[PDB]
């Protein structure tokens, strides 16, 4: 069955870096665009970054551009998120999502992971 598993969340210091992973199972990752969605405690959903199936187009949320970078390895069935120059406002749970389409052009997210927590102190 279709499953998304995230890993890498930890408690780090302000200004540090961290790298998150999302392993996909039960489908062909090379046919789907992917993205990251985060949620701070008691607040709403926020779009972080997205990438198309070929990795040739990337977009970012306004709060994380020039700081975060998204990548993927279709043969290893894995999506990554590199986070640099962290600040306290990055403390949230980060979800790995999969789109039905092969391109990052919509807000349709059919599958969600369980999420990983990041703490900035």
């Amino acid at each position: 069955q279709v499953q998304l598993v995230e890993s890498g969340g930890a408690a780090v210091q302000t200004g540090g870096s961290l790298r998150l992973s999302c392993v996909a199972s039960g489908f062909d990752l090379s046919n789907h665009a992917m993205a990251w969605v985060r949620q701070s405690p008691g607040k709403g959903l926020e779009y972080i970054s997205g990438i198309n199936n070929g990795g040739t187009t990337t977009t970012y949320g306004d709060s994380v551009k020039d700081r975060f970078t998204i990548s993927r390895d279709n043969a290893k069935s894995t999506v990554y998120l590199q986070m640099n120059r962290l600040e306290a406002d990055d403390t949230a749970v980060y979800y790995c999502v999969k789109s039905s389409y092969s391109d990052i052009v919509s807000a349709r997210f059919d599958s969600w992971g369980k999420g990983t927590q990041v703490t900035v102190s």
Partner: protein
């Protein structure tokens, strides 16, 4: 930054409720809308895509629409298991990405509604001696259990240093919460007054305190 949704709505079992979401020429007018449902402590789930199409495993009482720059999600025959937080979402050409709504918390009523009691507390003398000035705005005895809080220094909005707890059910089955603002003793004496305003289903109450 976000699409505009009402912060909270409710209805009685068997009733039909609707949730609004309003956008701009940059998003909803030119891009389709998606709806997501989230229960406490779990991931959000898609319940509607491409304006008005339902995923498999979503009851027929759910229905979506789009008109101009706004959308709506209709739920007929309210059941207890529909109590959740609902978000709208669409692509946005100005942001080059996805824009979300603020979220609407839906409650299935099972007791009479009640307006909150609000009490505001100035800093205590023991914490002022440790170079601290924290204010507390106590909110109690309200139903349904969703509120929004805003602080002001004199008459200007304050956003930094604000924390508000998730509403909690108490022994009379009504809700309570607290909001605290962390200040330095200079900021507190710097101004003429501070204020705490609470919103509950659209209605508002405000209180004010001053250094003595």
């Amino acid at each position: 930054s976000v699409l505009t949704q009402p912060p909270s709505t409710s209805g009685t079992p068997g009733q039909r409720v609707t949730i609004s979401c309003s956008g701009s020429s940059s998003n909803i007018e030119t891009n389709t809308v998606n709806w997501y449902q989230q229960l406490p402590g779990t991931a959000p789930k898609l319940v509607m895509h491409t304006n008005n199409q339902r995923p498999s495993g979503v009851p027929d009482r759910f229905s979506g629409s789009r008109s101009g720059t706004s959308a709506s999600l209709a739920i007929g025959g309210l059941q207890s298991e529909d109590e959740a937080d609902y978000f709208c979402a669409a692509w946005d050409d100005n942001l080059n990405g996805v824009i979300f709504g603020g979220g609407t918390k839906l409650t299935v009523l099972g007791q009479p509604k009640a307006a909150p009691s609000v009490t505001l507390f100035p800093p205590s003398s023991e914490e002022l001696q440790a170079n601290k000035a924290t204010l507390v705005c106590l909110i109690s005895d309200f139903y349904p259990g969703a509120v929004t809080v805003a602080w002001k220094a004199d008459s200007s909005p304050v956003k930094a240093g604000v924390e508000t707890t998730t509403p909690s059910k108490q022994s009379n089955n009504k809700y309570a919460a607290s909001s605290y603002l962390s200040l330095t003793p200079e900021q507190w004496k710097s101004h003429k007054s501070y204020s705490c305003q609470v919103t509950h289903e659209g209605s508002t109450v405000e209180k004010t305190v001053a250094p003595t």
